[PDB]
Each structure stands twice: as structure tokens, then as C-alpha cells.
Design a protein around this nucleic acid. Structure first.
Lengths: 36, 69, 191, 171, 197, 232
RNA sequence: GGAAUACUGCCAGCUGGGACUGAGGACUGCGACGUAAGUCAAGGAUGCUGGCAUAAUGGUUAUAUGCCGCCCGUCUUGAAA
RNA sequence: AAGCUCGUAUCAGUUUUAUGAGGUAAAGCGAAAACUUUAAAUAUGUAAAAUGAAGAGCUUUUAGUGGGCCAUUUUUGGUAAGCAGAACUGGCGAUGCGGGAUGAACCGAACGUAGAGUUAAGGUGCCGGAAUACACGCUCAUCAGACACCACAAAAGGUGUUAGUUCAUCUAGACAGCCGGACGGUGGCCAUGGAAGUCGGAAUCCGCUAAGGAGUGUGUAACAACUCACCGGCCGAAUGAACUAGCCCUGAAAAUGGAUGGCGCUCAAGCGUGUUACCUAUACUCUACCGUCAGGGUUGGAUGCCCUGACGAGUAGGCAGG
RNA sequence: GCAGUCAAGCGUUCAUAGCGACAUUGCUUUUUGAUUGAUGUCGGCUCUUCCUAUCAUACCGAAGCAGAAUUCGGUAA
RNA sequence: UUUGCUCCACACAAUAUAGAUGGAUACGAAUAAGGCGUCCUUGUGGCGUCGCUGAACCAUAGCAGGCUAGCAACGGUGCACUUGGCGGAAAGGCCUUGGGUGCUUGCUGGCGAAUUGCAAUGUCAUUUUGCGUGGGGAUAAAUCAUUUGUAUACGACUUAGA
């Protein structure tokens, strides 16, 4: 019954904003490759 | 009470009156409890005073009877 | 599909009486009485006559209807155990060391004591569950008979006896020693 | 919202040497006429490339349920969009009015397929006259003679914080 | 409306009861919770035990006597759930927590007082049938509470005495009910019934 | 979602479907059209060699076997329509496995033939066993101690699990041979045969029950009437 | 065949309870009601009544309680450290 | 800032009208998509109706300033993937206030001192003001979820659960089970000690059939036996397969003890959706007061006095009153 | 990894407008089993704690695992 | 230590109150079940009845509750005592006996209230600490200093001494 560590669901601001930037870049590349 | 499925309003009224549903309802402890709640809500201040007086009298008689028996 | 109602039937033979109250089931037949506490299930029991009992689930899902048939089969097993009983025959086999099986009384309770399994110096004790009687077969080699009203008790006793004589750190292709359930039947076998 | 059914009749924009346009009619379920007209323009453009300026709505009426208190089995044909392609769905809804059935369908779509009002198109709502013509068992189940069922485990509402007796769930 | 409210904690969901008690204490009501060993938690016993073991592993690394104190008793588990819902580091929160008592079993003097329930926290009224749930006594004993048997024996003794009291009360109630049934035909009875009494 | 996974087997023969029933219907229509006498027979547990022997016992005559409901529809079950008159009277009397014999030959001849024909087949459950059987205590031999034991070789070791489990016989393998610790009788004269008792008698392979072709009735294309003949 | 009701809208329809405010300081204006006299809710509060007249209200101060509030200046770079 | 001029002035980060533009391919309708006439406007110019505007033009003068970061949009060139070069427009800088537990670039909203009312964004179990509201569904996670997501682990796996689409079979009997049949050349042909449907290589044939593979597997040294492919009897009623979507589990992650903010929550206090009520910003409405500016009046402290209206963020810097 | 081979599927529906999961030539390369280490600004000791992706000890699963010994794997710090 | 200390009663002071203002009014268990009553062949029994909120039940009239005259009943209730039990989970409370003493609004009467001026908590609860009276009760230790060393940096610890 050695319960192991559990991953935190508390989201960090750095990760949240990085994910926002990743999504924006993903959409822009989707548009460009759909054009190509 | 017996009611055909999908019966219209006049048919419902006929079956209702025939089955005497309002009497069956008025003859029960549930409906009587509702009626008592409404009447107590409707009592006046003078009438609440009268209720207190009558409760004291009935109480006197009943305590006497309980001590006797 | 979330059925409105699901029902299962439970037949009652002419000799047994079933009492159900708040999901406690008592079955009393020719051979005794069994009691089952089914309050961990959510079902409704009804009867139309002394020969048939309905078990119903209202507005149940898949797991609820799955438990319904289980409840019916458990009550069926209680009826069968109270009217015909259960008899499990086990056989023990060996190559070199003869398995010695006895009924001993240790601390005021019944034990099946197993000696000399694969030459072991260890004594194996299997407590006899209450309600099941242990016998040794006549004119048959190395057969032990477990008889009882409760199929749960009899089958668990036979399973305990079989597991207590496990072969450790050997080849089960080569070493065949053990106690095995030879047959499962009833205490009445007219035909 | 609380849905109403509107008949909406529109046509092409009249011009010179162009009389008698194709009178396109539709039945739109919406909370109000403004939403009904917007939905009509959207569906008109999807059917054929007719812009809002290229068209004109000549009529819009509210259609009330004829027998609003008669229980009716409805078959509803719809199609809805998602990340995947558009899908066609058939559903059976037992209710007393088309608007009630349509509201039920919108809620069911939101709950099951996560779809929304802007994604659902109601192709047709029709009363299924014969009992035998129903297909879905969750509707066919309520059609048996002398249907009766209990309501086990009644949970009563409490107004006050504390109750002076254990509650019974009997019914 | 009572000066003290005694809640029988049996068959209540821990968090909903804790929310109710916290609001009442902050609003100024004295509350005594009894039978904390009979509180319920929704979810499987293994799941709630896992959550407690996570709580158990949390501790201050350089000095364990400073870290979170893991209380094992059911009354203390409930108290923890309540203190989490009070702002306990302020004077107002401390004054609120001073208005609460929690017990295992029903010791004196509360064993002769009226016990109430909180319907919005009752398992039978809240949980859907078929949902597994956990009992606080079993959870506490599995994590290290050592007085489950003592409390059970004391509660059995209390129940025996309470049953005797209720038998006497039932007899007296029957006698009084008869004495009132003999007086249903009087003029005062008719007038009271006309007024609703 | 929690569903039993159907067994997937890659074998040549495929279930024929509605078209096979259609062709059987057409063939029986042709036979009734182009023959005189149609007999209804019962062949419940009949082997293919026996069926083929009866099939070759005539070339002009035709034997049709198949679905009882399909044959009863082809013959005619109601008075709204039927190929010939009074055929529902014959159709109602058919009971189990159907057999149709189409011929133009003599009724007395076919009756005599079906009376005389007899075969000794495997015993069947719930039937009288003509001869009892009892496995002796020795090493168990294949035939069962009937034929010369010195001539025959004993039972194979591969059948010992089957006998021990399904046949409910205490059996042990010694030096490779199946044995039993005491003589074990399977059945007595005129005793209801169990499924497992039938299985064990067939496993020893002593075919002894007398099988026969029985007829319930027949019909003619000239007089159009039903005659009840009970030949067993 | 005859209604009723719902819903949506309109009334220069009527009427009850609660809260905050009372700026201005002769008159002048626009109106309302009246045969008139004049009156009025019409270019912003008046009438009647009670207690107290001092720490009572209030100020100041020390504390307590609820919520809030990071240590200043300089200097860098968008900016922060 | 100072002068001069005029104020039915002079205009405008706006629309419309007429005149252009990628003619990119949906006009429809032509001499047989190769023709060559048209069309709602995404997105800029010129010139003349809409809406708004009390200040405008010219000439002399004076101060501070002389970096950029982040994002949207379009565009050109690229990488495993990130991305780089341009142009536009926003946000921030000089900027407080409500909310997102917390915060450079997120959502609201810009600020004189107060009172009352209403709201934004965000919320309403408790912490914590405000419905443990109402309604229809879904989900049970052996560390669910309560989100950055039209992002990465993500291609799929699952005998979890729900709802669908298309195929199918079926009372001249469906699915599941029991019991029967499962045949003949033939132990087909080649190598093998042997190989008979089942260690091996080649077409896999012909007949009788309700139906039966020159065989789906176990099984023997070879057989045999069982088996399933297929057909029948039995009783009665819908069943199966392949896909789609939703929620759930897996879809890898280390190392002091810790985090949806905490408690806790399971017909939720989770997820989708609908309808209401409610809570509260320095925002909106109304009032009082302070100041600034402005417009009217003033021959009977005029640096004043009276009446009225609108406004009030601020670094460098400017002007004024103390 | 390179080129492929067909495609489970997909591509605005469109089989060789085009993509594309899972599976199949050649490599240091010749066959009969011949001879053919890096690291300089890091490293020592002591010594605490934690992870498990377990070397040993505990319990299990499979394997011609006879026995003995071993191999692979599961829980487990 | 100039009646010190302590427990009762009245008699006045001071104290400060996370907050009296009719009553915290006692079965247990189940919830796909129960409570109450009644009966029997006594149990998982038969019959009847109840829930659907405590919206209850009990209390509750009198100068913030005065002073008196009767009637009916021998009930209700308080106070100071007394009998006999019971309760150890934190019992500190529950029940009962007897007599005395009051009140009684169960019913009928007779006097008083005003002026607090038209509202102002309009002062009625209970914690503690002192001082005065009259009713009783009981007549110690610890520390320093000295001393030991099973202890010890200093403290502390542990021994001994009329």
C-alpha cells in the first residue's frame, strides 16, 4: 500500500500561455498548408 | 378509478363523478390534514385565544381522567 | 435500453417453503433450512401462488438486469440444495508417497488433515465448513465425498482441499500428485 | 428556448423581365421570428446560392399544434454537422406537440452528440399513425396494454435545514 | 431554533454535512455531531482509502512533528473536512469552530437529547441506488483508529437502555391516546375541531 | 459492448438460404406432378448409408427429405389452396422428420418391402437396450470384452479423459492402458437409456438396436384420398 | 357551431408597501381646478409631536473585529528580476 | 504660444453614388471548356448625396522626444517540428479600477469628492456576496473531471456504457442451446518405416444429396474417437455483422510532502444544453458638492456679481494660482 | 534511412487529380563459427533523502521446466 | 502571618458576556421499506391504520402578572424536605415514595392599574471577583541554603537531615 505520487492538475501560467501560442501556430500552419 | 386510455375531458368528468373521487379524497387523513393546516392558517388572534382557553379546559378534563385511570 | 420492467421466474416444488422479507431469503425444504442475505441487490419479490415467485427490476440498467438473473439462480441453488443436496467426489492420486487423509478434531472443530504429500513432513489442515459432511468412499480407492445443502460451502471446501495440495517448484507435466474434484452431483441420483 | 414553429415563405428578388419567382417555403423551429428568419436565410443559401439581398421573405406565420393535448408518436428526421462529416439521424419521440418533440430532440442532441442549435437541421417531423410502424424500443415500450409502473425511492424536498425524523423513501 | 442542535451523523455524506455545519456555525448556531463513526463517503472503500493514504504520505520532510497531523478517528476526519470549509486562521473562524463538538457514539449528556438529521446531506436522499459508498468506521480502523470495538460495545449498551426507555414511552403514549379518545365527543372537542385543533 | 465474440471458422460450405428451400419446393411440386403415389415416412435417426440404400432401392422412384414446414406448405396445409383435394388431411398427420416417396409402383409391394426392411444401428437415448453391457475389472479393451480379448488391442490412452469426465466412469491409466477397479454395468434390459449411456454404448461401438423404416400414410394421384396404414 | 383562455403588445387605467435625496430662498413662469372668489401636488420640504441639553450626538485617541494593503529610492531594458 | 484672416468657414481614421483593380471561375445564353458579354463585394484611389462637427487656414515662434516587446491580418520563403523577411492594425510604455485563487501582454472597464439605483466580465455547496434553483440527458475513473482545445502525448487498443448509419437472416421459424445426420470412388496423386481429411508439394475433382471440405482442430506409430463446415427435430421471437458519434479506461513517467486555490463533490458541487432568479466595479442613470472650461446677462470684491451647460487618467514637458 | 511492392483506410464523392497504418530487396558482407576504449576540468571520499526503469532477498506465471541449475515475465523500494 | 483558609444563606458592590428573551421535545433498524394499534395457531404471521413535513407537540390569559369572595374536582404544578432505586463514555443526570407548604386560567364574581404624557432594550439572563453579616468545617507544604552521586555545561535530576 505504498501509494505513489499523483500528477498535479494545477495548470501553470507558463504552460497555459505556451499552449495558447502552440494552438495559434497550429492554425496558421493549417491555413498555409491548405493553401499549398 | 376506471378510465379509458386517452379519454377526453368530458369523459374524465363523467368517470370522476361516477367514481366519486372528491368524496374519497375528502374522506382521508391526508386531505383532512391539508384542511386542518389551511384552517389553522386562517385563524384570527381572538380565535387563537379561544383555542388556548378550550385547550386548557380539555386538558383539565383529560388529566383528571388519566389520573383516575 | 433502460427497460421499464424485467422479470425472472423462480419455481417452488411441492415440498419447500420460501420466506422473503426485506430481501432476506429463507428456504425450508425436506432437508433443512438455508438463509441468504440479498440486501446488496436491488430487486422486488412477489408471488402469485405457492409454486412460482417473481423477481423484478424496475427501470434498471445493464448491471441491474445482470444482477437480476444472478438473484434468481442463487435462490434456485438454495431450493436445489434444500431438496436434493450436493455431493462432490474428489480423488487423490500419487506416484510414490501415499497421501494420507483423515478427519481430525483440533480445538473442538472438524479438520481434514493431509499427511505425507510428496513426502512432506508438513501437516496440512483444511477446516471443514459448517453444514458440509466429509465421508470416505466405500469400495473405491482414494475418494473423499463432500455432501451438503449449501453448494457454496461444498464447492469452497473442495476448492480449499484442492488448493492446499499444490505442487511447488516442480514440473506439473511430471508430478501429478494432488487432490482433484472427480465429480459433482446431487445427494439423490435416482436415475 | 421555448420553441415555436414558423412557416416561412420567401422568394427571389423581383427584377425587370423576371416575374413569378420560385416560392420557397420552409418550417423553422425557433424561439422567435428574428431567429426564424435568420435560420431561413441560412437554409436557403445552403439549398441554393441565394443571398439575403438576392431574396425576400414574403410571409411568416406561427403554426400552432392542431390537437395540442393529444399524445402522439413522432418520427423526426434530422441531419447535423460535427468535426466529421454531416450525419443523418432518425429519432422517435412520444409527445403532445411538434414543438415539444423538437425541443426534446435539441436537448437530446446536445446531451448525446454534443451538437447545438446551429448544427442541427430538422428535415421532417411526422406523426406515426400506426403503432406497428414504430422502430425504437424506447418508444415502443410505452405502447403496451394496461401499462403500469411504480416510482421506487421517492426523495422528498425539504425546506428547512434540519429534520426531526428519519425520512422514508416510500411511495 | 434550538440553543444546541444535535445531529446524528449516521447515514450522512461527509462533505455535504460539513458544508451545512460550517454555514450554521459561522451564522452562530451551536452544533454537536454524534456517531461520527457512522458517516458515509460516496465512492468505493478502496478509493477513499487510497485518498487517505495520499494524505498520509504528505508530511514535512525535515521534521515530521511539524508536518500535517494525520488524525485517524472518525470525529477528527469529519472535523478536518469542516475546518477546510471554515476560515480557521481568523478570530471569527476560531469563534465559529468553538461552537462545534463532534463525537464517536452518543456519550452523556447527549444520549437523552433529541437528535436531528440534515436531509440535504442524507445518503438515502442524495446518492443514487447502486452507487458504492464507504463507511467512516471501517475507513478509520483500516488507517489506524483503535477504538472501533469499544465504541460498538458502548453503543450496544446505549441501545439496550434506549429500547427500554422507548417501551415505557410507548406505553404512556398509548394510555394518553386513549384518554384523549374518550374526550373526542365533548363540546370542547367539537369547538376545538371547528377551530382546527 | 460486452458481447460474445462469434466463432470465426474458415470452411468451404456455406449455409444455402432461401434459394435451397425454393428448389426443394419446386422439386416436390415436380415429383407430385409426375408421379402417382406419394408416401409419408419417418426417418428420425437414420444413417446416410441407410438413406442411400433406400435411395438406390429404386431408380424410377424418388425420395425427398427436408424441412417439415416447407414440405407441409408445398403439400398444402389449408383449404384456401392446395395442389390436390383433401391434402391437408395427410399433411396434418405428419409428425417428425419428413420423408416423401414418389412412385407409380404397387402399394402392396412397397408395404411388404418397408415391412421386411430392418437394420441394426446404434442404440439411442430413451430407448430399450437389446443387450446389457458391463465393463470388466481388467484392462479395458476397445470392443468391451465381447470379441476375443487376446485378439483385440486395449482402449487407447487418448480416450481416458473423455471416459473419466463425460462418461462418469472411474478410470486410471496404468502403463498406458485404461483400467477400472471393479466391474461396471451400464444398463439393464428395457431400461431408459441416458444420453451418456447411449454415448458409452456407441463408444464401444456395439450397434445392436433394430432400426426400421416406418410409414404413416400415403396419397394417390388417381383417387385423391388418404389411407391410414401404420407400418413400423 | 358558438365561445372562453393562453401568448405578445398598448393605456395621457387604478391602487398598496420599501429605500435614498429636500439642492434653492420676497414676487415674476408654464399650467391645473373653479361662473367667480380664489385654491393647487404647477420654476427644488413643509406641518405636527416627543426626549435631551450633556459627553447624549460628535471629535480625538488607544485597542478589538471584518475586508484590503508587499519596502522605499536609484538604475536598466518593451518589461521584470 | 503670439499675430493676421474668416466662421451659410473648414472639414472627417465613416458610409453611399459614378469612375478602376486580383477576371481569379459559381453567372447564361451564344460561332461546333477553346471563345468573350454580364453579376451580390473581401479590398484601395479619384471625384459629388448621407451622418457628424465650432472652430478652421496662414505667418512667426518654444519644449520634450529620436527604443521597442506582445498579438491579429495579409503576404513571400522554410523546417523533423518550431519558424524567418515584410506591410497594416491593435495592446503596453505615461494607467489606477472589477474579474481570471495568483501574474507584463487574458476578459470587462478607463479614474474629481459622496449618496441611491442598475449592470459588465465573472460567478451563486462551504471558504465567499449570490438558487445544495428548475429541466432533459451522459459519465463511475486502483489517484475521473471541473482547461489553456477547432493543441501535444493522439495511431490506435477495450467482452465499459449510450445513441445512431448501412448491410443482413427470420414463424414456407432468426440468435443461443440440446439431440441426430456429417455419405460413396477414396486409404485421390507423389516422395516416407508408417501418414487413411489433420508432418510434407500440386490442381482440389465426380455422384447421391435436407446436407456433408479430397477437411476446421484436438487426437493415434498408422488407424480409430470426438469435433466444425453444412442440413434436420426440439420450444418459441426477434437476432447478428460492419461502421459513426458521446462519455469512460489504456494511449509512459521518474525522483524532499502537496495541490481543479482549498475543503470536498458522484441522479455532482463533473460534462452537454435550455429557462429563470440572484450577487457585485472607480462602468451606466439620477442628485448634491468641489474645480476647469464654455456660452448668456451685468453703470446699479468689474481681477468681480448673476444665470446656464458640459467636462475631471497621466511620465517628460507646458501654463497658472498659492 | 533510402527507393520501392500492393493496399487497412483516407483524399471536396472522385482507385494510377493524390495521400496513406500495418506487413515484404541491399548495407559494415562475407557463409561451414577464420582473428578483426574514451574522457582533463572534472574525479575523489563521507553522508542524508527520494524514484523505480529491481541487482539480491519474499511471493507468483510460463517455457523439454525430469531432478539440479537456468531463461523470460508479474507484484514488490 | 494581629480570625488567617474553606463550604452554605442574605446584602451590597464591582466584572464582562463571538451574543437567554416559552421548551435542545431521547427507540433501534430499513429505505426495492417502515411506524402505530389489534388478534392468534407467536412468526420473515393475519387484519386495520399512518406518512405525502416540526405548518408539529407541549406550553401559553392574571401589576413582567397585584389584593380578595365562592363553585366543582382531589386533578396539574412549583418550593423546602423524605423513601426506594437506576445511570461510569465525558456517569454529575433520570425515575420514584410520603407528608408539609403555596398557586391554580376547570367555572362564577368584586376591587387596583391612568401621568412612562403618541415610540425610545426601557433594564427581569448568567460568569466571575470583593466587602459585610450568621451557619458550620480543617488545623499543611514547597523552595532556597546544607547534603548524596544511580545525575550533571548552567539549569534540571536523584538522595539525606528536628
Amino acid at each position: 500500500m505504498r501509494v505513489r505520487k499523483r500528477q498535479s492538475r494545477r495548470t501553470s501560467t507558463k504552460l497555459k500561455e505556451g499552449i495558447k501560442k502552440k494552438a495559434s501556430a497550429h492554425r496558421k500552419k493549417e491555413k498555409k498548408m491548405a493553401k499549398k | 378509478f376506471a378510465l379509458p386510455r386517452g379519454a377526453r375531458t368530458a369523459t374524465v368528468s363523467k368517470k370522476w363523478a361516477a367514481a366519486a373521487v372528491c368524496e374519497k379524497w375528502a374522506a382521508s387523513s391526508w386531505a383532512k390534514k391539508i384542511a386542518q393546516r389551511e384552517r389553522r392558517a386562517a385563524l384570527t388572534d381572538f380565535e387563537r385565544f379561544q383555542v388556548m382557553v378550550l385547550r386548557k379546559q380539555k386538558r383539565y378534563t383529560v388529566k383528571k381522567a388519566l389520573a383516575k385511570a | 435500453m433502460k427497460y421499464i420492467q424485467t422479470e425472472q421466474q423462480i419455481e417452488v416444488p411441492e415440498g419447500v417453503t420460501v420466506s422473503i422479507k426485506s430481501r432476506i431469503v429463507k428456504v425450508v425444504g425436506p432437508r433443512g433450512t438455508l438463509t441468504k442475505n440479498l440486501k446488496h441487490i436491488d430487486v422486488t419479490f412477489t408471488k402469485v401462488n405457492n409454486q412460482l415467485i417473481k423477481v423484478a427490476v424496475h427501470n434498471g440498467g445493464r448491471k441491474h438486469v445482470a444482477a437480476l438473473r444472478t438473484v434468481k439462480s442463487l435462490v434456485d441453488n438454495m431450493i436445489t440444495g434444500v431438496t436434493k443436496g450436493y455431493k462432490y467426489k474428489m480423488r487423490y492420486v500419487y506416484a510414490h508417497f501415499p497421501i494420507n487423509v483423515n478427519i481430525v478434531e483440533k480445538d473442538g472443530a472438524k479438520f481434514i488433515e493431509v499427511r505425507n504429500f510428496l513426502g512432506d513432513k508438513k501437516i496440512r489442515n483444511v477446516p471443514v465448513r459448517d453444514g458440509v459432511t466429509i465421508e470416505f468412499s466405500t469400495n473405491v480407492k482414494d475418494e473423499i465425498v463432500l455432501s451438503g445443502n449449501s453448494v457454496e460451502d461444498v464447492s469452497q471446501n473442495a476448492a480449499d482441499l484442492q488448493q492446499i495440495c499444490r505442487v511447488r517448484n516442480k514440473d506439473i507435466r511430471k508430478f501429478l500428485d494432488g487432490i482433484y474434484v472427480s465429480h459433482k452431483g446431487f445427494i439423490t441420483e435416482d436415475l | 428556448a421555448h420553441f415555436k414553429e414558423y412557416q416561412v415563405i420567401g422568394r427571389r428578388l423581383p427584377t425587370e423581365s423576371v416575374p413569378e419567382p420560385k416560392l420557397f417555403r420552409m418550417r423553422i423551429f425557433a424561439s422567435n421570428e428574428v431567429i426564424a428568419k435568420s435560420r431561413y436565410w441560412y437554409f436557403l443559401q445552403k439549398l441554393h446560392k441565394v443571398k439575403k439581398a438576392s431574396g425576400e421573405i414574403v410571409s411568416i406565420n406561427q403554426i400552432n399544434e392542431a390537437h395540442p393535448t393529444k399524445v402522439k408518436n413522432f418520427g423526426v428526421w434530422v441531419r447535423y454537422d460535427s468535426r466529421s462529416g454531416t450525419h443523418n439521424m432518425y429519432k422517435e419521440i412520444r409527445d403532445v406537440s411538434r414543438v415539444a418533440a423538437v425541443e426534446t430532440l435539441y436537448q437530446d442532441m446536445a446531451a448525446r452528440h454534443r451538437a447545438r442549435f446551429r448544427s442541427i437541421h430538422i428535415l421532417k417531423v411526422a406523426e406515426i399513425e400506426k403503432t406497428a410502424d414504430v422502430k425504437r424500443q424506447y418508444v415502443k415500450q410505452f405502447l403496451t396494454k394496461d401499462l403500469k409502473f411504480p416510482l421506487p425511492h421517492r426523495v422528498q424536498k425539504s425546506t428547512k435545514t434540519f429534520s426531526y425524523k428519519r425520512p422514508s423513501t416510500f411511495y | 431554533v434550538e440553543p444546541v442542535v444535535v445531529i446524528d451523523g449516521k447515514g450522512h455524506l461527509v462533505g455535504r454535512l460539513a458544508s451545512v455545519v460550517a454555514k450554521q456555525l459561522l451564522n452562530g448556531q451551536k452544533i454537536v455531531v454524534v456517531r461520527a463513526e457512522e458517516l458515509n463517503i460516496s465512492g468505493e472503500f478502496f478509493r477513499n482509502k487510497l485518498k487517505y493514504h495520499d494524505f498520509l504520505r504528505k508530511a514535512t520532510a525535515f521534521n515530521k512533528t511539524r508536518g500535517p497531523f494525520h488524525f485517524r478517528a472518525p470525529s477528527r476526519i469529519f472535523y478536518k473536512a469542516l475546518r477546510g470549509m471554515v476560515s480557521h486562521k481568523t478570530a471569527r473562524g476560531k469563534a465559529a469552530l468553538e461552537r462545534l463538538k463532534v463525537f464517536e457514539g452518543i456519550p452523556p449528556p447527549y444520549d437523552k437529547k433529541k437528535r436531528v438529521v440534515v436531509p440535504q446531506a442524507l445518503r438515502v436522499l442524495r446518492l443514487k441506488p447502486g452507487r458504492k459508498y464507504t463507511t467512516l468506521g471501517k475507513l478509520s480502523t483500516s488507517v489506524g483508529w483503535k477504538y472501533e470495538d469499544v465504541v460498538a460495545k458502548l453503543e450496544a449498551k446505549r441501545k439496550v437502555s434506549s429500547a427500554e426507555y422507548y417501551a415505557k414511552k410507548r406505553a404512556f403514549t398509548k394510555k394518553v391516546a386513549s384518554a384523549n379518545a374518550t374526550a373526542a365527543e365533548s363540546d370542547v372537542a367539537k369547538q376545538l375541531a371547528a377551530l382546527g385543533y | 459492448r460486452s458481447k460474445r465474440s462469434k466463432l470465426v471458422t474458415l470452411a468451404q460450405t456455406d449455409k444455402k438460404g432461401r434459394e435451397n428451400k425454393e428448389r426443394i419446393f419446386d422439386e416436390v411440386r415436380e415429383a407430385l406432378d409426375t408421379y402417382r403415389y406419394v408416401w409419408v415416412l419417418h426417418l428420425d435417426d437414420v444413417r446416410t448409408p441407410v438413406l442411400q440404400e433406400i435411395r438406390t432401392s429404386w431408380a424410377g422412384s424418388k425420395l425427398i427429405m427436408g424441412k417439415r414446414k416447407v414440405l407441409q406448405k408445398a403439400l398444402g396445409e389449408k383449404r384456401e389452396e392446395e395442389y390436390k383435394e383433401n391434402l391437408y388431411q395427410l399433411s396434418k398427420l405428419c409428425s417428425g422428420v419428413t420423408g416423401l416417396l414418389f412412385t407409380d409402383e404397387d402399394v402392396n409391394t412397397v408395404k411388404e418391402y418397408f415391412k421386411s426392411y430392418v437394420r441394426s444401428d446404434y442404440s439411442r437415448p430413451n430407448t430399450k437396450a437389446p443387450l446389457t453391457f458391463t465393463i470388466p475389472e481388467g484392462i479395458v479393451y476397445s470392443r468391451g470384452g465381447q470379441i476375443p480379448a487376446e485378439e483385440d488391442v486395449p482402449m487407447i490412452h487418448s480416450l481416458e479423459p473423455t471416459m473419466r469426465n463425460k462418461f462418469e466412469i472411474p478410470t486410471k491409466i496404468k502403463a498406458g492402458k485404461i483400467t477400472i477397479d471393479s466391474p461396471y454395468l451400464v444398463c439393464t434390459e428395457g431400461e431408459k437409456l441416458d444420453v451418456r449411456q447411449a454415448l458409452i454404448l456407441k463408444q464401444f461401438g456395439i450397434a445392436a438396436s433394430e432400426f426400421k423404416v416406418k410409414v404413416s400414410a400415403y396419397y394417390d394421384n388417381d383417387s385423391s384420398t388418404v389411407e391410414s396404414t401404420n407400418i413400423n
